[PDB]
């Protein structure tokens, strides 16, 4: 047999260390296309070790990820099943479903709108995307692909899969907080349709796990340097609907995040505005608003 | 041919009749394969070039600040094996010294021998947070595998970890941060990198780093195993000017073990008894297999090396990392 | 009172953000401050916690993310490889392999003790 | 009356008592660490890893010795 | 802090030194709370004083 | 005069003479000046009589 075909046998056996030693070999010719195709099968069968090795030999995730390849990764019933079906039904009906209905990138985008809640108005519902989607139904290659893989493994419940795409990516703190909001709200919809409590507790464990992976991420950032840590917290994220780590965290309800020291100092420095007095506050601010002469004796930041 | 290449694959002057052409392949390597992706910038340099141009390149054209240490990794050229814990304590001590001094690691570069232990040492020090350490390699051009892949001006060329088990060409180590490729015009022949590496290590030690607490830039060499040429390069550094101290890392055999068995029993250099010296030549000519006709000459080199014992620091495993020995030799060879 | 303070720190964010994003004069006087805001975007139109950041600055922030993701997973590993359950784990396998390997050595050394008396007689 | 100014010699006695308490305190602390469960597990772990290396070395040496003794029997 | 412990061991009148260091650290704690800086600083000085105590 | 000993013999006999002084409460007459046998028993009490 040819080693692409023998790889798909290894994918089944789930014997990844035999696959990385013999299937992967010096001079072993991989016909162009089969390597990416085996990557797609590895995602949908939840072979997180196999995607770790197939990016180790290099699949160049930017180049693999395409609008239709990711779309097939959204419609594959193969692998661990999900709750997305139900979640799309909510969204289709609220805007206005046959079982053969093949879901869409824009269609899950409006779902993301429903559970993340408030704003989080994703790129999939930005008008620029709806015209590329209209035109097609490295332009079609998603810019920071690892984000799109995170939202997927969060919606289709795939945990050891998801934690992999978290470490390998960027916008790290943001990705954790978004994962926390997306898991918690899916956990709400689990109990809202009051289905099996197995999915409701599992998503709520997961909302806690992807939850803590934010707070010690911030905690040890504070140990690195105080300044750049705050620069992270207030960093404007275009990919996460032009908002901040504080805004996502309060939308997710992650008190520990808005209670760790670094965020609190930021908040206290906003209650100062562009003045620096503190000390006996409360009384000194009242004396300033009643005596416009008396503000001339209070210090100001440079 | 004499250059080792194919008879139709064409296109020093002694028997190779070379002509001195301008350089053409320099740029950046995208390391696909071998786990993490690492960018490593490479320049082909002729073996008879001036060292100050490479210094100007490495300072300004490479954005590399001058280090406080030059840990060289001269070792066995063929592939060998070690104890697992010995390789672990070796790698941990090497990366710890590399962070504490901000050193440049002058590893050989082709993935065979002690270079493979240095690349495994960088696997322990993930270095995904501080890879500034210029793990600058000095390997010859004619020996690297897929020479056609690395042709290209300022081009980020793909370089897979494809290493054919029967090919004479050796792939480079994928986890080095930089590369210097010594081109003498031939293919598949050693010795094209040695003298250039000697003059650049002397030219780095020529520079007085801004501190110069002891003096200059302090260079310390590490030896693990090696041929009789490791005893010879030990004779090079151990009686050099200014005499450069060397940790002869033990527990490994070949040259370093014979040097250690000399150094533990040498006293004032030539003050070794005949008794163990006989068993020495037995192991020098039987265990390391180097014929006795030159093992008498290995007596005279070993005892001339113990004439300056002090700089040759031993290390043993059994906590107690090699960075103790590296910093100890760093404080010995500083004046 | 088990939680307390944490809920308070949460209520701070809603507080600090809302009182920031208000006009300057108090309720009876906000009228004047609206007409100040209106006149501001009728002369600039007709005729806080978001630092718009620069590229070179997101370059060092993403790098700061990429040196803050790895050191953590190192701590996660060491914690596990120093926690008193996994330390007792790795003792017991290593002692197990020390059982068989010393089993080999004592049994084989008995052949060598036989060889001592064998060489004594045959030499 | 809870401020008994001391004669300097008796004050030196008080100091030397206090110094003894300092030393025994820190010694007890060292006993409390070197006889807490955690550190004992740590030291046993590291030392067993050393023992496992060195027993592997003895086994390889044994192989070389056994082959050598068989060769000596061949020359006998 | 660690320098203070090394000074605490080596020396004399350590009961006095200990309790005085306790008071000075708790005092710096409420003063730094009275300036409401990093509460890690106030908590740090407070844990400091609890330790010397 | 000053001499030196093997470390195992120095540790076993050095631990022995101090844990005689633990139990018997003896007085230990020495030369007093740190050279040779007095230097060895000074390190002997600094071996385990400083931890008991």
Taking CB atoms and an 8 Å cutoff, what residues of chain C touch B130?
A: 67
Report the SS3 class of residue A253: coil
What is the distance between the alpha carbons of residues B183 and B181, in angstroms, rounded to a whole number? 6
What is the distance between the alpha carbons of residues E53 and E19, in angstroms, rounded to a whole number? 6
The residues with which B30 forms a beta bridge, in sequence order, are: B39, B158
Q: What is the DSSP-derived secondary structure letter of residue F21? A: H
What is the distance between the alpha carbons of residues E24 and E46, in angstroms, rounded to a whole number? 10
Report the SS3 class of residue B312: strand
Nearest-CA neighbor of B249 among B194, B320, B199? B320
CB within 8 A of D23, min separation 6: which ones? none
In DSSP notation, C36-105 reads HHHHHHHHSS---------HHHHHHHHHHHHTTSHHHHHHHHHHHTTSTTHHHHHHHHHHHHHHHHHHHH
Resolution in units of Å: 4.0
Cβ-based burial of F52 (10 A; exposed 0-12, middle 13-18, buried ≥19): exposed
Chains with ≥3 CB–CB distances under 8 Å to D = B, C, E
Q: How far is C59 from chain D (nearest CA, A)?
A: 42
Q: Do D18 and E9 touch (CB under 8 A)?
A: no
What is the distance between the alpha carbons of residues A12 and B179, in angstroms, rounded to a whole number? 40
Taking CB atoms and an 8 Å cutoff, what residues of chain D touch B318?
A: 50, 53
Determine the residue of chain D that is closest to B86 in CA distance: D53
- Pair of tokens at residue F29: 């007459």
Residues 11-40 of E with CB under 8 A from D: 12-15
Q: What is the DSSP-derived secondary structure letter of residue B40? A: E
Vertex A246, ends A242 and A252: CA angle to 5°?
95
Q: Do C74 and B130 touch (CB under 8 A)?
A: no
Q: Do C115 and D70 touch (CB under 8 A)?
A: yes
The residues with which B159 forms a beta bridge, in sequence order, are: B31
Decide if A57 contacts B32 (C-beta within 8 A).
yes
Taking CB atoms and an 8 Å cutoff, what residues of chain B touch D50?
A: 318
- Pair of tokens at residue C58: 């997101």
State the sign of the Cα–Cα–Cα–Cα dihedral A40, A46, A48, A53.
Answer: negative
What is the distance between the alpha carbons of residues B313 and B234, in angstroms, rounded to a whole number? 12
Nearest-CA neighbor of C67 among F29, A223, F2? A223
The residues with which B140 forms a beta bridge, in sequence order, are: B182
Determine the residue of chain A that is closest to C52 in CA distance: A236
What is the distance between the alpha carbons of residues B116 and B107, in angstroms, rounded to a whole number? 10
Decide if A248 contacts C11 (C-beta within 8 A).
no
Taking CB atoms and an 8 Å cutoff, what residues of chain C touch A265?
A: none
What number of residues does chain E have?
A: 53
What is the bridge-based pairing of β-strands B153-159 and B38-46? unpaired
Q: Do C109 and D62 touch (CB under 8 A)?
A: yes
Q: Which helix (H) or strand (E) holds B314?
A: strand B312-315
* CB of B81 less than 8 A from some CB of D: no
Decide if B29 contacts B44 (C-beta within 8 A).
no
Decide if A251 contacts A117 (C-beta within 8 A).
yes
Taking CB atoms and an 8 Å cutoff, what residues of chain B touch D57?
A: 83
Report the SS3 class of residue B64: coil
Query: Is the bond leading into A170 cis (omega within 30 degrees of zero)?
Result: no
Residues 59-78 of C with CB under 8 A from B: 66-67, 70-71, 74
Q: Which residue has the tokens 């993310």?
A: C65
**B219-224 sheet: strands from edge to edge:** B104-106, B70-72, B219-224, B246-249, B312-315
* CB of B319 less than 8 A from some CB of D: yes
In DSSP notation, B14-32 reads TTT----PPP--EEEEEE-
- Pair of tokens at residue B3: 């250059």
What is the distance between the alpha carbons of residues A176 and A209, in angstroms, rounded to a whole number? 9
CA C119 to chain CA centroid, Å, is 65
Taking CB atoms and an 8 Å cutoff, what residues of chain C touch B129?
A: 66-67, 70-71
What is the distance between the alpha carbons of residues B261 and B266, in angstroms, rounded to a whole number? 9
What is the distance between the alpha carbons of residues B119 and C109, in angstroms, rounded to a whole number? 39
Cβ-based burial of C101 (10 A; exposed 0-12, middle 13-18, buried ≥19): middle
* CB of A178 less than 8 A from some CB of C: no
Decide if A172 contacts A248 (C-beta within 8 A).
no
Q: How far is A136 from chain B (nearest CA, A)?
A: 31
CB within 8 A of D42, min separation 6: which ones? C82, C87
Q: Which helix (H) or strand (E) holds E47?
A: helix E39-52
Q: Do E9 and D26 touch (CB under 8 A)?
A: yes
* CB of D49 less than 8 A from some CB of B: yes
In DSSP notation, B149-216 reads TT--EEEEEEE-----TT-S-BPBPTT-SEEEEEE-S-SS-SSSSHHHHHHHHHHHHHS--SS-SSSS
* CB of B126 less than 8 A from some CB of C: yes
What is the distance between the alpha carbons of residues B144 and B14, in angstroms, rounded to a whole number? 23
* Cα distances (Å, whole numbers) of residue A71 to A140, B40, B99, B260: 12, 35, 45, 64
Determine the residue of chain D that is closest to C104 in CA distance: D59
Decide if B171 contacts B221 (C-beta within 8 A).
no
Q: What is the DSSP-derived secondary structure letter of residue B67? A: P
Q: Do D53 and B319 touch (CB under 8 A)?
A: no
Q: By what technique were these coordinates determined? A: cryo-EM
Q: Do E40 and A261 touch (CB under 8 A)?
A: yes
CA C4 to chain CA centroid, Å, is 26
| CB contact burial A116-153 (16+ within 10 A = b; e otherwise) | beeebebbbbeeebeeebeeeeeeeebeebbbbbbbbb
Q: Do C67 and B130 touch (CB under 8 A)?
A: yes
Q: Which residue has the tokens 């955690």?
A: D38
Taking CB atoms and an 8 Å cutoff, what residues of chain A touch E30?
A: none
What is the distance between the alpha carbons of residues C39 and C50, in angstroms, rounded to a whole number? 25
Q: How far is D53 from chain B (nearest CA, A)?
A: 8
Q: How far is B319 from chain A (nearest CA, A)?
A: 27
Neighbours of E19 (CB within 10 A): 12
The residues with which A237 forms a beta bridge, in sequence order, are: A243
């Amino acid at each position: 047999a040819s080693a692409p075909d023998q790889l798909s046998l290894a994918l089944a056996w789930n014997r990844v260390d035999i696959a990385r030693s013999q299937i992967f070999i010096y001079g072993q010719q991989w016909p162009v296309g089969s390597l990416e195709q085996a990557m797609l099968d590895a995602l949908v069968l939840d072979r997180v070790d196999f995607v770790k090795l197939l990016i180790e030999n290099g699949v160049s995730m930017h180049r693999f990820l395409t609008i239709s390849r990711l779309e097939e990764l959204y419609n594959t019933r193969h692998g661990p099943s999900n709750t997305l079906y139900h979640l799309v039904r909510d969204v289709k009906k609220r805007e206005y479903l046959p079982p053969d209905y093949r879901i869409s990138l824009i269609d899950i985008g409006l779902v993301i709108e429903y559970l993340m809640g408030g704003a989080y108005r994703c790129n999939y519902t930005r008008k620029r995307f709806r015209t590329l989607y209209h035109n097609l139904f490295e332009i079609n290659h998603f810019p920071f692909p690892f984000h799109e893989l995170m939202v997927w493994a969060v919606l289709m419940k795939r945990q050891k899969m998801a934690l992999f795409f978290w470490q390998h990516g960027e916008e790290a703190m943001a990705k954790a907080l978004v994962a926390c909001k997306l898991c918690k709200a899916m956990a709400h919809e689990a109990s809202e349709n009051d289905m099996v409590d197995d999915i409701s507790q599992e998503l709520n464990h997961n909302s806690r796990d992807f939850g803590q992976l934010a707070v010690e991420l911030l905690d040890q950032s504070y140990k690195q340097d105080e300044q750049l840590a705050m620069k992270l917290l207030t960093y404007e994220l275009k990919n996460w609907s032009n908002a901040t780590c504080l805004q996502l965290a309060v939308a997710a309800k992650h008190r520990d995040f808005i209670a760790h020291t670094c965020s609190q100092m930021l908040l206290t420095d906003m209650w100062m505005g562009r003045l620096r007095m503190r000390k006996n506050s409360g009384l000194k601010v009242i004396l300033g608003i009643l005596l416009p002469p008396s503000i001339l004796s209070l210090e100001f930041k440079n | 041919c004499c250059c080792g290449r194919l008879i139709g694959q064409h296109v020093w002057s002694i028997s190779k009749h070379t002509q001195l052409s301008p350089t053409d392949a320099f740029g950046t390597i995208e390391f696909q394969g071998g786990g993490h992706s690492n960018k490593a910038m490479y320049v082909r340099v002729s073996f008879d070039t001036k060292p100050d141009l490479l210094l100007h390149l490495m300072t300004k054209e490479w954005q590399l600040e001058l280090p406080k240490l030059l840990i060289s990794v001269h070792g066995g050229l063929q592939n060998f094996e070690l104890q697992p814990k010995l390789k672990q304590v070796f790698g941990k001590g090497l990366i710890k010294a590399a962070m504490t001094t901000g050193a440049w690691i002058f590893t050989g570069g082709v993935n065979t021998g002690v270079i493979r232990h240095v690349g495994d040492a960088l696997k322990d020090h993930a270095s995904k947070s501080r890879g500034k350490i210029c793990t600058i390699g000095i390997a010859p051009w004619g020996i690297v595998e897929n020479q056609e892949d690395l042709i290209g001006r300022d081009v980020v060329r793909p370089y897979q970890t494809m290493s054919n088990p029967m090919s004479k060409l050796t792939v480079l180590n994928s986890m080095h941060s930089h590369f210097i490729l010594a081109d003498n015009g031939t293919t598949g022949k050693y010795g094209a990198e040695v003298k250039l590496r000697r003059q650049l290590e002397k030219h780095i030690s020529l520079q007085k780093i801004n501190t110069r607490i002891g003096q200059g830039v302090p260079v310390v060499a590490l030896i693990v195993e090696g041929g009789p040429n490791v005893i010879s390069i030990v004779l090079e550094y151990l009686r050099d000017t200014p005499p450069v101290p060397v940790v002869v890392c033990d527990g490994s055999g070949r040259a370093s073990d014979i040097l250690a068995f000399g150094h533990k029993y040498s006293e004032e250099g030539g003050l070794i008894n005949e008794s163990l010296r006989d068993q020495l030549l037995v192991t020098i000519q039987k265990t390391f297999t180097y014929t006795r006709t030159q093992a008498q000459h290995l007596f005279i080199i070993l005892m001339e090396c113990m004439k300056k014992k002090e700089l040759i620091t031993v290390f043993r495993m059994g906590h107690q990392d090699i960075d103790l020995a590296i910093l100890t030799a760093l404080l010995k060879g500083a004046n | 009172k088990s939680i307390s303070n944490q809920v308070w720190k949460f209520q701070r964010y809603q507080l600090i953000m809302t009182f920031h994003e208000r006009p300057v004069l108090p309720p009876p006087l906000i009228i004047f401050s609206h007409m100040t805001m209106i006149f501001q975007h009728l002369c600039c139109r007709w005729r806080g916690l978001k630092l718009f950041i620069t590229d070179d600055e997101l370059k060092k922030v993403h790098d700061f993310e990429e040196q803050c993701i790895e050191e953590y997973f190192r701590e996660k590993d060491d914690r596990f490889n120093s926690s008193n359950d996994e330390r007792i784990r790795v003792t017991s396998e290593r002692v197990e392999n020390m059982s068989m390997r010393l089993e080999e050595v004592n049994e084989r050394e008995h052949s060598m003790k036989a060889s001592l008396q064998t060489v004594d007689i045959r030499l």
